[PDB]
Amino acid sequence: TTALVCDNGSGLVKAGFAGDDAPRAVFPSIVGRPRHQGVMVGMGQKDSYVGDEAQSKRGILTLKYPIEHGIITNWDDMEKIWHHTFYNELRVAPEEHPTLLTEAPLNPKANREKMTQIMFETFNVPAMYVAIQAVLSLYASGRTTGIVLDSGDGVTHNVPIYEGYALPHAIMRLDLAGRDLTDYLMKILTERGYSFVTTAEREIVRDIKEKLCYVALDFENEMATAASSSSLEKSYELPDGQVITIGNERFRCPETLFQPSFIGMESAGIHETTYNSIMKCDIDIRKDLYANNVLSGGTTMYPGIADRMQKEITALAPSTMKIKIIAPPERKYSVWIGGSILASLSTFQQMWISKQEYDEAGPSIVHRKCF
Amino acid sequence: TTALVCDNGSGLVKAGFAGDDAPRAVFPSIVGRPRHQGVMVGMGQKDSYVGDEAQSKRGILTLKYPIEHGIITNWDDMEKIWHHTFYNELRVAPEEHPTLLTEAPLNPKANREKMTQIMFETFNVPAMYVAIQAVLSLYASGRTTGIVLDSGDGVTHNVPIYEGYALPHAIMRLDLAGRDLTDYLMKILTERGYSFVTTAEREIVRDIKEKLCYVALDFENEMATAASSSSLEKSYELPDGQVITIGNERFRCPETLFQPSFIGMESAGIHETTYNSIMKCDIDIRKDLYANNVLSGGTTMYPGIADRMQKEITALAPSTMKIKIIAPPERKYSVWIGGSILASLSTFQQMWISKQEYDEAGPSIVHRKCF
Amino acid sequence: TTALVCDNGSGLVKAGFAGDDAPRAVFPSIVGRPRHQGVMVGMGQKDSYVGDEAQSKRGILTLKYPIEHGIITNWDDMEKIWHHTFYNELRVAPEEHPTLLTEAPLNPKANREKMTQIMFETFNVPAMYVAIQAVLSLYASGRTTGIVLDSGDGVTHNVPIYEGYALPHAIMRLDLAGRDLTDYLMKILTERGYSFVTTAEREIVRDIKEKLCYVALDFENEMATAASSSSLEKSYELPDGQVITIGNERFRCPETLFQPSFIGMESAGIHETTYNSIMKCDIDIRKDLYANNVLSGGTTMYPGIADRMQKEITALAPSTMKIKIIAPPERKYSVWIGGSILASLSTFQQMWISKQEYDEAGPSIVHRKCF
Amino acid sequence: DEKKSTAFQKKLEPAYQVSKGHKIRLTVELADHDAEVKWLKNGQEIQMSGSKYIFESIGAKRTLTISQCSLADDAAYQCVVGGEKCSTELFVKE
């Protein structure tokens, strides 16, 4: 048989069979109810638009994300996301297919257990597994060691692994991620004059975020440049017209990853929670972690975050120590691709939570010897 | 059974069975009382000439319209219009026939409810319905989307619909329409020398309006042409003689649709209430509305309003956006023809307000789940 | 010297000297051009009626608001509003007078900077200041803490302040306010039969809004009452006659503050953006914010909004937490009165943007250390 | 057992029958609530001829309603989804 490496993600659910390069089904995890009435009779529109079908009908929908910050907050939506994932995007019944889910570190126990209840009871998967979203991005990156920075769309967690042993204590989890950056770019495009309050243009400004934004190498020098020069004023075409010219709001959205004091987050940036995650480890394995710092996640695909990250983490580390960042150009899907390595291993066959192993011990089987 | 798609209209009542191309009974909605005595005895003339019979006896009648601007202002006349519609023009008793009425957007609630009282109590229709006059002109035009401009004889309303969901807030209703244009052409043919004060020649000048008038592509250029050249001075034969030569009063009557400041209407033209109706919608569905702008209604059948409308709505829209106007050559009857689509749907059979559903809940059943 | 606490407002400009109870000059911010010709010669009428002089000549004017939703959209009108404010209403030359302006949160930077250009260049104020319209309504209310709800005529913003420190991130700005409610009451008095399309009767229906409307304590119970009983059908006399009897359209206009789905606004009501503004703050200062919720702004002067607000914000908060709303009966002018506290402070004397401090740094001095 | 109607959840029949000046309706159903059929007729894409051909699509399910059918309308409707066409022969019966 073949195992499906699913991936809940955060705003970009991705799924595909174990044994592929890239996942066969990448679409945003949205569920839209239609707000307006519908005067045309006999149209036969559904009560729930899910997935990429709801990305083409955005101006009529109330788009909702069933995964706010890692956690699933509405299970009746997430069941529709999975049902649309298996039946429409992949067109395979999960009765004869194992399923690899990927859940972030430090989630609630009830989230992982409830996820296992929804997989075994409703979909009747024969054997599913729940794997940690940062370790798979260490499989795909081809490193046995090194702190990995999985800055997802939903949540940003800085897991260290040395010689295949993850360090549980040093794992740092930060709520600030791509969703909150998109909310901050909604906050600072109002500073220019372009209002975005409706969630349907949440997908518009995020697309701005995909194209225009970049992590600047310095901040006060680039704020000294974009306030006087006009070389950074880059325009964008909305889907109706009224092209907008973003100047200093371009490198100011992704800087909130490195200055969480912009949005009132107490913590340090992910250039220092990486350093606090390395200093939390023992003082002899740090040398491989400073060399093997991995970046993954969609939020890490800004142009120039690998140089600003290296500049700040070099400014915090001892200067006699080599700093290297392994960021292959498939940063976004690296959580999936190692999953396609994970379920394809023959030694992983013992790791599946079987249904016979499930019904004997209920939903709390996930935190036992099988993970 | 067969359902009758009636249509109150404004100055042109049209009715026919659901399942036809064109309505079987098209006649003006006039009620004329005879003003003069009648010295011939035994003539046996009626106290009320209604419909097209009162269009042949105009020089003796005081013609009255029971529908001024959408609203029915005199119900004892409108009952005679409907009675003449069923019994003489269509010759079918409405006891064994459902009836689809069409009422404009943003009418009074008492108009729609009182219409339902007159249909169930007096005529005893078994199941009638009241549908919005702009959506049926979206059925007939063969578009699932797009702002529709139903410039009726009585009232002009710019309803947007996206993917079969009408937008209630963006609906713009303008009192200026064909009746008020006919009053303005009565106002500007007095500027040449031909007096029209009697309402019996209200039908004369309207016929001038049907033949001669056209929406000009520019206004100040055509006012610079018709004031010097004589290529626009086109004549017309009244039913007695004294042929009249209309020059610059030809394209100046239908320009009041685009310049409501001619007749003291505060609002913008219907080339800008369309744009304000699109800008009132969300900023992602506008692309289909600029492409799918529908024109319907008798008043939109001027020669060249589809090019002047496209010129002005292109001058107001972002210029990177495609502008197309869907105006099939049955602009006038497009409100009816979609009605012939509407009552012929099998899924519409649940939508009828039955008499058992009426008597349980009184006249306020129309604004409940059945519409 | 004395400082003038000006206040742009939204539909009600108010101005007076620092050191008064109430502002000396309260008038609507309208600019009316006369639409009609004027056959009387030698009348000498002006090309621009501004202020309360244009409230007595409404039936001939095209009244325009230079402030649509917080932003100034037409500066040549707003210069006339200020010029009429200083020279006619207050009769003081601003050469020897500092000027406290009040601008809402989250306005465009170009609005605030352009306002500073108009104040220093044209009027030549020696030292002006721009203060946030919600904090002054916290000075006047006599609270050092607490979320303040400045529901202006133009825009409605829910700023939290704890111990004199405003929270920048938790500030929620909602476009829905008194202007949009007045447009919705124009929308639902057409539902009864009384048409209002001309902007000159924009002031008529707003006066209806001042007298008749009230925020109901429940909605479905009051819609169950006003549909059957007739105790809510209250009449009003227009300035010509034809007294109108508003029934269930009375408490249905101000309910759009609490149901923004009536006018297609996506967001929640201001009974929940207050709760989302408190939940955005830290989880230890919330106790003082639930007790110290301030209401200000003209739109908050409905009879019974302090009880419906407390009912809904009590239904959303934890029920073990005390809910109190501080709403003194000068809700409308509370934005001004704290301004009369603000410019009268001796410690505020360093805060003025001097002209020497202006000309050294241009119009961008406002976002520096002086605010 | 390979039952057809793959993208169809219902295909047209092999033939329908209707009276001249009488209305009928074709019933395809599609296994997808967004899959459309082509409605072709004797190899010609059925377009919604006013009300003489009416695509009522209830969710997935597409239904060609032909009003006041005439011996003109007596012919084959091929509801041709890409890969699945049902050549019903409508029998308008005067």
Coordinates of N, CA and C in Angstrom, one line a residue, chain A residues 34-43 45-46 49 56-60 196 198 200-201 237-242, chain B residues 132 135 138-139 143-144 162-169 282-287 318 320-321 342 345 347-348 351:
Chain A
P34 N -21.3 31.3 2.5 CA -21.8 32.5 1.8 C -22.7 33.4 2.6
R35 N -22.3 34.7 2.7 CA -23.0 35.6 3.5 C -24.4 36.1 2.9
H36 N -24.4 36.2 1.5 CA -25.5 36.8 0.9 C -26.6 35.8 0.5
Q37 N -27.7 36.3 0.0 CA -28.9 35.4 -0.1 C -28.8 34.5 -1.3
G38 N -28.7 35.1 -2.5 CA -28.9 34.3 -3.8 C -30.3 34.5 -4.3
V39 N -30.5 35.4 -5.3 CA -31.8 35.6 -5.8 C -32.1 34.7 -7.0
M40 N -31.0 34.3 -7.7 CA -31.1 33.2 -8.7 C -31.6 31.9 -8.0
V41 N -32.7 31.4 -8.5 CA -33.2 30.2 -7.9 C -32.8 29.0 -8.8
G42 N -32.6 27.8 -8.1 CA -32.1 26.7 -8.9 C -30.6 26.7 -9.1
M43 N -29.9 27.6 -8.5 CA -28.5 27.6 -8.7 C -27.8 26.4 -8.0
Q45 N -26.3 26.2 -5.0 CA -25.0 26.4 -4.3 C -24.9 25.8 -2.9
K46 N -23.7 25.3 -2.6 CA -23.5 24.6 -1.3 C -23.5 25.5 -0.1
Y49 N -18.3 26.2 1.1 CA -17.2 26.2 0.1 C -15.9 26.0 0.8
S56 N -11.6 31.1 -5.3 CA -12.1 31.8 -6.5 C -13.4 32.5 -6.3
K57 N -14.1 32.3 -5.2 CA -15.4 33.0 -4.9 C -15.2 33.8 -3.6
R58 N -14.1 34.6 -3.5 CA -13.8 35.2 -2.3 C -14.7 36.4 -2.0
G59 N -15.1 37.1 -3.0 CA -15.9 38.3 -2.8 C -17.3 38.1 -2.3
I60 N -17.8 36.9 -2.2 CA -19.1 36.6 -1.6 C -19.0 35.8 -0.3
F196 N -8.3 47.7 4.5 CA -8.6 46.2 4.4 C -9.1 45.8 5.8
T198 N -12.3 43.6 5.6 CA -13.0 42.4 5.2 C -12.0 41.3 5.1
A200 N -12.1 38.7 3.2 CA -12.0 38.3 1.8 C -10.8 38.9 1.2
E201 N -10.4 40.1 1.6 CA -9.2 40.7 1.1 C -8.0 40.4 2.0
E237 N -0.9 45.4 -8.5 CA -2.2 45.5 -9.1 C -3.2 44.6 -8.4
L238 N -4.2 45.2 -7.8 CA -5.3 44.5 -7.2 C -6.2 43.9 -8.2
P239 N -7.0 42.9 -7.9 CA -7.9 42.3 -8.9 C -9.0 43.2 -9.5
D240 N -9.1 44.4 -9.2 CA -10.0 45.4 -9.9 C -9.3 46.5 -10.5
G241 N -8.0 46.8 -10.1 CA -7.4 48.1 -10.5 C -6.9 48.8 -9.3
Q242 N -6.8 50.1 -9.3 CA -6.2 51.0 -8.3 C -4.9 50.4 -7.7
Chain B
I132 N -38.3 39.8 -8.2 CA -37.6 41.1 -8.4 C -37.3 41.3 -9.9
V135 N -33.7 40.6 -11.5 CA -33.2 39.3 -11.6 C -33.7 38.5 -12.8
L138 N -31.8 39.1 -15.6 CA -30.5 38.3 -15.6 C -30.7 36.9 -16.0
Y139 N -31.9 36.3 -15.7 CA -32.2 35.0 -16.3 C -32.2 35.0 -17.8
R143 N -26.8 35.2 -18.0 CA -25.6 35.5 -17.2 C -25.9 35.1 -15.8
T144 N -24.9 34.4 -15.1 CA -25.1 34.1 -13.7 C -24.6 35.2 -12.8
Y162 N -23.8 38.6 -8.0 CA -22.6 37.8 -8.2 C -22.8 36.4 -7.8
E163 N -22.6 35.5 -8.8 CA -22.7 34.0 -8.7 C -24.1 33.7 -8.2
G164 N -25.1 34.3 -8.7 CA -26.5 34.1 -8.2 C -26.8 34.7 -6.9
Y165 N -26.0 35.4 -6.2 CA -26.2 36.0 -4.9 C -26.4 37.5 -5.2
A166 N -27.6 38.0 -5.1 CA -27.8 39.5 -5.2 C -27.2 40.2 -4.0
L167 N -26.7 41.4 -4.2 CA -26.2 42.2 -3.1 C -27.2 43.2 -2.7
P168 N -27.8 43.1 -1.5 CA -28.9 43.9 -1.1 C -28.5 45.4 -0.9
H169 N -27.3 45.6 -0.3 CA -26.9 47.0 0.0 C -26.5 47.8 -1.3
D282 N -17.9 44.3 -2.9 CA -16.5 44.0 -2.5 C -15.5 44.1 -3.6
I283 N -14.3 44.2 -3.3 CA -13.3 44.7 -4.2 C -12.6 43.5 -5.0
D284 N -13.2 42.3 -4.9 CA -12.8 41.2 -5.6 C -13.8 40.7 -6.7
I285 N -15.1 40.9 -6.5 CA -16.1 40.5 -7.4 C -16.3 41.6 -8.5
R286 N -15.7 42.7 -8.4 CA -15.9 43.8 -9.4 C -15.5 43.5 -10.8
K287 N -14.5 42.6 -10.9 CA -14.0 42.3 -12.2 C -15.0 41.6 -13.1
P318 N -11.3 51.7 -13.4 CA -9.9 51.6 -13.7 C -9.7 51.1 -15.2
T320 N -7.4 49.5 -16.7 CA -6.8 48.2 -16.9 C -7.9 47.1 -16.9
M321 N -9.1 47.4 -16.7 CA -10.2 46.5 -16.5 C -11.1 46.4 -17.7
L342 N -38.5 31.5 -15.2 CA -38.5 31.4 -13.7 C -39.7 30.4 -13.3
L345 N -39.3 26.6 -14.2 CA -38.4 25.7 -13.5 C -39.1 24.8 -12.5
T347 N -37.8 23.4 -9.9 CA -37.3 23.7 -8.5 C -38.1 25.0 -8.0
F348 N -38.7 25.7 -8.8 CA -39.5 26.9 -8.4 C -40.9 26.5 -7.9
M351 N -41.5 27.3 -4.4 CA -41.4 28.8 -4.1 C -42.8 29.5 -4.1

